[PDB]
């Protein structure tokens, strides 16, 4: 079947999709669907479909968690979050990242701090991920910076960041494992800077039961009926 006939067969399921995405997200998913309609090769169409899969999931992730969807290009790096949130330590950040300058450009799906987006409570987010992981067996990985063996304190508030990595791919374990491995160096770097950060990473795939994703079930039916069917019809034909 011709690419342009697959798009037509799935114009309604992709309109239901684009209708539920954050404004900047749905505009991106819309531009990509057109590229797929005018795709001159099964290669370029796959590459476009891949980007819709991840972008549309990240928007439904922002929705379920009531966070802000920020298009990749507009996403902050690790260096930008410290510069703005820990200026007294950015200079020492740069000094301790001479042999690992790539750390500065690391760009998670969500770079938040507690009241760079702001979040009410970092400990609340970590509890929700740890809860679903324990109740539903969803693979997560979590790392918290911790200078020496320092204790939490009740007499003073510290500024803190929350780094989240999401993903919609078949290999859920490999993603959480490879994500948490990339942040280990920076987590141990923040420890040596006395900066409190928390790294959370998760992933969903299409075999995950519809009630156990990191996005609302409704969003799940929206992705399976559109981006999944596409991939089915994109290979078969």
């Amino acid at each position: 079947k011709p690419i342009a006939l697959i798009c037509a067969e799935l114009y309604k399921p992709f309109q239901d999709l684009f209708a539920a995405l954050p404004k900047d997200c749905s505009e991106e998913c819309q531009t990509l669907f057109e590229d797929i309609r005018n795709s001159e090769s099964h290669a370029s169409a796959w590459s476009s479909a891949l980007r819709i899969k991840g972008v549309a999931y990240a928007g439904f992730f922002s929705l379920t968690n009531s966070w802000r969807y920020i298009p990749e290009d507009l996403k902050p790096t690790l260096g930008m979050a410290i510069q703005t949130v820990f200026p007294d330590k950015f200079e020492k950040f740069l000094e301790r990242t001479h042999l690992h300058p790539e750390y500065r450009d690391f760009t998670p799906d969500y770079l938040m701090c507690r009241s760079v987006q702001e979040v009410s409570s970092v400990s609340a987010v970590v509890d929700r991920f740890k809860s679903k992981s324990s109740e539903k067996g969803r693979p997560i990985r979590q790392e918290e910076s911790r200078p020496k063996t320092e204790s939490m304190q009740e007499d003073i508030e510290v500024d803190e960041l929350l780094i989240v990595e999401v993903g919609y791919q078949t290999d859920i374990e490999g993603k959480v494992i490879s994500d948490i491995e990339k942040w280990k160096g920076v987590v141990n770097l923040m420890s040596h800077l006395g900066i409190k950060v928390n790294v959370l990473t998760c992933a969903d795939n299409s075999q995950t039961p519809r009630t156990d994703w990191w996005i609302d079930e409704k969003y799940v039916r929206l992705l399976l009926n559109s981006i999944s069917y596409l991939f089915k019809e994109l290979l078969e034909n």
């Epitope: 400990s123 509890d127 200078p147 020496k148 063996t149 320092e150 204790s151 939490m152 304190q153 009740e154 007499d155 003073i156 510290v158 006395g194 900066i195």
Partner: antibody
Framework: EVKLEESGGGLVRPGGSRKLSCAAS????????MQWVRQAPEKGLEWVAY????????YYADTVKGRFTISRDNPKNTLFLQMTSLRSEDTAMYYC???????????WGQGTLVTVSA | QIVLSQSPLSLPVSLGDQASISCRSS???????????LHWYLQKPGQSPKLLIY???NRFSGVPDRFSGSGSGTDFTLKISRVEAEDLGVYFC?????????FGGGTKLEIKR
């Protein structure tokens, strides 16, 4: 007046278990981390466990890890210590304490004596 | 673990005189949030401990001003400006900068006679 009242001490055979409780009064107990400290007879103080106000963070001394559980019921203004697989070296006076605004031991109970012995 | 070393073990002191107790830390007690969680307690014989000083030099409410503390990093001192008969007992420093929270072994204040 801030007061902490421990209960639950007594005689316990080695290998046995005991649950200690601490009733808190005179402050909003739910807003503060709570601690257990112990003192073997004729010895110094030895910290046992900490629990944050919302129970999200819990700390243990290595000597009790895997045997003791700290917990709290904030609506009931009560702190607990579940002790299991007790050894004679656990024989101590057990105090609950709190900082009422920090991780130092500002307020102490009168303590309750736990004797582990056959 | 952070080891707190108290000196002297025992401090005979005449009524009215000053007393000083030292507490040395095996690692800095400066927390990454800027505070230093080194505290001083008194345990009179047969009673539960009482806080005297928290975070190095802050006198706890109700504590007589003859008690004071000073220091930073790894070295800390508790001063009793003018010893009273009631000041009899064991003095402990303790730190809550690092888990596990730890105590020194205690200094036994002894009244000279």
């Amino acid at each position: 007046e801030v007061k902490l009242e421990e209960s639950g001490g007594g005689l316990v055979r080695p290998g046995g278990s005991r649950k200690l409780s601490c009733a808190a009064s005179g402050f909003t107990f739910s807003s503060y981390g709570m601690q257990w400290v112990r003192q073997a007879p004729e010895k110094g103080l030895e910290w046992v466990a900490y629990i944050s106000s919302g129970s999200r963070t819990i700390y243990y001394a290595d000597t009790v890890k895997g045997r003791f559980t700290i917990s709290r019921d904030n609506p009931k203004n009560t702190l607990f210590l579940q002790m299991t697989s007790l050894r004679s070296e656990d024989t101590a006076m057990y105090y609950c304490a709190t900082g009422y605004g920090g991780t130092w031991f500002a307020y102490w109970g009168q303590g309750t004596l736990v004797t582990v012995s056959a | 673990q952070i080891v707190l070393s108290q000196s002297p073990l025992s401090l005979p002191v005449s009524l009215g005189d000053q007393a000083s107790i030292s507490c040395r830390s095996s690692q800095s007690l400066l927390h990454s949030n800027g505070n230093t969680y080194l505290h001083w307690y008194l345990q009179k014989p047969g009673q539960s401990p009482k806080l005297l000083i928290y975070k190095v030099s802050n006198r706890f409410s109700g504590v007589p001003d003859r008690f004071s503390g000073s220091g930073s990093g790894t070295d800390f001192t508790l001063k009793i400006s003018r010893v009273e008969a009631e000041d009899l007992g064991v003095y402990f420093c303790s730190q809550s900068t690092h888990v596990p929270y730890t105590f020194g072994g205690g200094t036994k204040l002894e009244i000279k006679r």
